[PDB]
Amino acid sequence: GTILIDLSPDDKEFQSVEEEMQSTVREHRDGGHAGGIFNRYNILKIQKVCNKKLWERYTHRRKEVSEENHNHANERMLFHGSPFVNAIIHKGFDERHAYIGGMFGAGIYFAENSSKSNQYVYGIGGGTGCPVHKDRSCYICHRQLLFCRVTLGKSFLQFSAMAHSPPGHHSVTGRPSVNGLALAEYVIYRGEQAYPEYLITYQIMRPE
């Protein structure tokens, strides 16, 4: 029951999503090994992901979390990069899309930095890169990210360089503690706490 609606580049909604995508690129400590070498993207398409059942699944859980957290869902828009992007948009997030070996345990991981999520597009550590060229830094092949609505609720703060949420919390926040340019990363332990709202198709761009 998923349909994808293309946004026009003229639509303010397209523009605000592209701006989040572009302005949250950073340099990574792997020098580009996993995600490639780039300072910006070429955005090819932004589509709105519409699925009534998945949406109501999200909002049902959002209200539960909200009622357990003084009427505060603590909702963010965050990036998600995954080899499973096609299954996520049709079926929603579940345990099969968790990063089992993640530093905050087996959950589903999201990033404020688009360039962080870009590192998982072709798998953990960038896998073997793009299917066609086996190039983790491919400038030709089309990549896809999700920009997602994520319910954090009471988030456990972890200072740092499917399982369950820590008791009394609805999520974990990875607060970066040495790379002063890194933004936060987040983990949820229930698929129903994220809705894959925008599908963004793009290429990374070779720097000049």
Ligand X SMILES: O=c1[nH]c(-c2ccccc2)nc2ccccc12
CA distances from 102 to 12, 98, 99, 189 (A): 35, 9, 5, 12
DSSP letter (8 states) at residue 39? S
SS3 label, residue 62:
helix
Among 29, 133, 164, 206, binds Zn ion (CB under 5 A): 133
171 binds ligand X (CB under 6 A): no
Q: How far is the CB of 84 from ligand X (least distance, A)?
A: 6
Q: For residues 100 and 140, which CB has a smaller minimum distance to Zn ion in the complex? A: 140
16: Cβ contacts below 8 Å, ≥ 6 apart: none
141 binds Zn ion (CB under 5 A): yes
82 touches, from Zn ion, ligand X, none (C-beta below 5 to 8 Å by class): ligand X
Near ligand X in 104-133, by CB under 6 A: 109-111, 116-117, 120, 124
Q: In three state form, how does the secondary structure of 151-205 look? A: ECCCEEEEEECCCCCCCCCCEEEEEECCCCCCCCEEEECCHHHEEEEEEEEEEEC
Near ligand X in 61-80, by CB under 6 A: 79-80
Cβ neighbours around 40 below 10 Å, total:
14
28 binds ligand X (CB under 6 A): no
134 binds Zn ion (CB under 5 A): no
Annotation: binding site: 130, 133, 138, 141
Residues that bind Zn ion (CB under 5 A): 130, 132-133, 138, 140-141
